């Protein structure tokens, strides 16, 4: 079924036109973005959108983010746009920021999982914008993965999940940030962070004041998702353990745990910076930015190699690290080992 369009070098418009044609015809198109790859459909066409949920096997109440290329499009999808929304748009769009607002009647309820609110974003990616421009349609698009697998950050990840199952994949290379957009709820004062992501909280806080963090960012079970990445948490075949604390103590803890799970005859994977004696070891990088960029790539490598346990080194809950920790903590099922410097 699928047509793959390599655009990772030059961005020929006639190629993007192929994909834009598929969006118009109510078909599915996977496309790169600065955050992760998205599985897009015409957000105006309710049955096209249904096909996203079906392809992914995604719960109907996990809503979808609508991608736009101009600000006049936000006016069509939302009503009651507050001023703090305009400030954030002006400063951070196009960018890894998603706003939740009151929806207008033009947004089908299948996008919003039944709710009166809609999640909108203007992606900072030439390919994603050009597709939206040439489709002349707003594009509904969660992450382009089978529900339960990790998010995709390259067209390889998309293809291993959906090649032959969806109409089109646009390959624009590995995504630069690597974790999903940040989501702010501007449906109430004060605003509330629903999902930490590509735009760090400190940045947002320079523009609008301090904001509330929704308890979902820290694990708490939510039964209604106002935004994606809040309620579901299949995002694995392996036990995942996160080790947090001072570096030298974490690395020592991981060492004991590799031995322990090998003693139980199990295949051990480790993600982090230390040198370890494991079956599989992915080096994620020195900085938090590099970590976010390689996170999902790493987790997909661990699922491919069929390791029984994944041991991850924590990172500082700061900059991109709030997000990388949030996604790790949602994958391991918050199985965290905290090691401390002793005070006696
Ligand atoms: C696909 C990508 O745009 C994703 N929905 C995000 O918000 O990061």
Swiss-Prot record:
<feature type="binding site">
    <location>
        <position position="235"/>
    </location>
    <ligand>
        <name>ATP</name>
    </ligand>
</feature>
<feature type="binding site">
    <location>
        <position position="58"/>
    </location>
    <ligand>
        <name>ATP</name>
    </ligand>
</feature>
<keyword id="KW-0547">Nucleotide-binding</keyword>
<dbReference type="Pfam" id="PF03481">
    <property type="entry name" value="Sua5_C"/>
</dbReference>
<feature type="binding site">
    <location>
        <position position="62"/>
    </location>
    <ligand>
        <name>ATP</name>
    </ligand>
</feature>
<keyword id="KW-0963">Cytoplasm</keyword>
<feature type="binding site">
    <location>
        <position position="67"/>
    </location>
    <ligand>
        <name>L-threonine</name>
    </ligand>
</feature>
<feature type="binding site">
    <location>
        <position position="181"/>
    </location>
    <ligand>
        <name>L-threonine</name>
    </ligand>
</feature>
<feature type="domain" description="YrdC-like">
    <location>
        <begin position="13"/>
        <end position="199"/>
    </location>
</feature>
<keyword id="KW-0808">Transferase</keyword>
<feature type="binding site">
    <location>
        <position position="121"/>
    </location>
    <ligand>
        <name>L-threonine</name>
    </ligand>
</feature>
<feature type="binding site">
    <location>
        <position position="195"/>
    </location>
    <ligand>
        <name>ATP</name>
    </ligand>
</feature>
<comment type="function">
    <text>Required for the formation of a threonylcarbamoyl group on adenosine at position 37 (t(6)A37) in tRNAs that read codons beginning with adenine. Likely catalyzes the conversion of L-threonine, HCO(3)(-)/CO(2) and ATP to give threonylcarbamoyl-AMP (TC-AMP) as the acyladenylate intermediate, with the release of diphosphate. Does not bind tRNA.</text>
</comment>
<dbReference type="GO" id="GO:0005737">
    <property type="term" value="C:cytoplasm"/>
</dbReference>
<dbReference type="InterPro" id="IPR050156">
    <property type="entry name" value="TC-AMP_synthase_SUA5"/>
</dbReference>
<keyword id="KW-0067">ATP-binding</keyword>
<dbReference type="InterPro" id="IPR010923">
    <property type="entry name" value="T(6)A37_SUA5"/>
</dbReference>
<dbReference type="GO" id="GO:0006450">
    <property type="term" value="P:regulation of translational fidelity"/>
</dbReference>
<dbReference type="GO" id="GO:0005524">
    <property type="term" value="F:ATP binding"/>
</dbReference>
<dbReference type="InterPro" id="IPR006070">
    <property type="entry name" value="Sua5-like_dom"/>
</dbReference>
<dbReference type="InterPro" id="IPR017945">
    <property type="entry name" value="DHBP_synth_RibB-like_a/b_dom"/>
</dbReference>
<comment type="similarity">
    <text>Belongs to the SUA5 family.</text>
</comment>
<feature type="binding site">
    <location>
        <position position="35"/>
    </location>
    <ligand>
        <name>L-threonine</name>
    </ligand>
</feature>
<dbReference type="GO" id="GO:0003725">
    <property type="term" value="F:double-stranded RNA binding"/>
</dbReference>
<feature type="binding site">
    <location>
        <position position="141"/>
    </location>
    <ligand>
        <name>L-threonine</name>
    </ligand>
</feature>
<dbReference type="InterPro" id="IPR005145">
    <property type="entry name" value="Sua5_C"/>
</dbReference>
<dbReference type="InterPro" id="IPR038385">
    <property type="entry name" value="Sua5/YwlC_C"/>
</dbReference>
<dbReference type="GO" id="GO:0002949">
    <property type="term" value="P:tRNA threonylcarbamoyladenosine modification"/>
</dbReference>
<feature type="binding site">
    <location>
        <position position="143"/>
    </location>
    <ligand>
        <name>ATP</name>
    </ligand>
</feature>
<feature type="binding site">
    <location>
        <position position="117"/>
    </location>
    <ligand>
        <name>ATP</name>
    </ligand>
</feature>
<dbReference type="Pfam" id="PF01300">
    <property type="entry name" value="Sua5_yciO_yrdC"/>
</dbReference>
<keyword id="KW-0819">tRNA processing</keyword>
<keyword id="KW-0548">Nucleotidyltransferase</keyword>
<feature type="binding site">
    <location>
        <position position="151"/>
    </location>
    <ligand>
        <name>ATP</name>
    </ligand>
</feature>
<protein>
    <recommendedName>
        <fullName>Threonylcarbamoyl-AMP synthase</fullName>
        <ecNumber>2.7.7.87</ecNumber>
    </recommendedName>
</protein>
<dbReference type="GO" id="GO:0061710">
    <property type="term" value="F:L-threonylcarbamoyladenylate synthase"/>
</dbReference>
């Amino acid at each position: 079924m699928t047509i793959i369009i390599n655009v990772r070098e030059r961005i020929e418009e006639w190629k993007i036109r192929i994909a834009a044609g598929f969006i118009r015809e109510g078909k599915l198109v996977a496309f790169p973005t600065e955050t992760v790859y998205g599985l897009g459909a015409n957000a105006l066409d309710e049955n096209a959108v249904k096909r996203i949920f079906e392809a992914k096997g995604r719960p109907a109440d996990n809503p979808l983010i609508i991608h736009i290329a101009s600000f006049e499009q936000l006016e069509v999808l939302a009503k009651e746009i507050p001023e703090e929304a305009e400030m954030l748009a002006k400063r951070f769009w196009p960018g890894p920021l998603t706003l939740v607002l009151p929806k207008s009647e033009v947004v089908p309820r299948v996008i919003t999982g039944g709710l009166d609110t809609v999640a909108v974003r203007m992606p900072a990616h030439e390919i994603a914008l050009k597709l939206i421009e040439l489709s002349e349609r707003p594009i509904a698009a969660p992450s382009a993965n089978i529900s339960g697998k990790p998010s995709p950050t390259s067209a390889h990840h998309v293809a291993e999940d959906f090649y032959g199952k969806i109409e089109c994949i646009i390959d624009g290379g590995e995504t630069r940030i690597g974790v999903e957009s940040t989501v702010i709820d501007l449906t109430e004062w004060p605003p509330v962070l629903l999902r930490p992501g590509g735009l760090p909280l400190e940045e947002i806080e320079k523009v609008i004041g301090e904001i509330r963090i929704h308890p979902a960012v820290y694990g708490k079970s939510v039964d209604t998702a106002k935004a994606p990445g809040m309620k579901y948490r299949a995002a694995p075949s392996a036990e995942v353990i996160v080790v947090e604390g001072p570096r030298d103590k974490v690395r020592r803890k991981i060492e004991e745990l590799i031995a322990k799970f090998k003693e139980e005859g199990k295949k051990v994977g480790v993600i982090g910076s230390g040198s370890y004696d494991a079956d599989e070891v992915f080096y994620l990088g020195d900085t938090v930015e590099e970590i976010a960029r390689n996170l999902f790539k790493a987790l997909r490598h661990m699922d491919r190699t069929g390791v029984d346990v994944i041991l991850a080194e924590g990172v500082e809950e700061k900059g991109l690290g709030l997000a990388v920790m949030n996604r790790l903590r949602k994958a391991s099922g918050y199985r965290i080992i905290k090691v401390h410097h002793h005070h006696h």
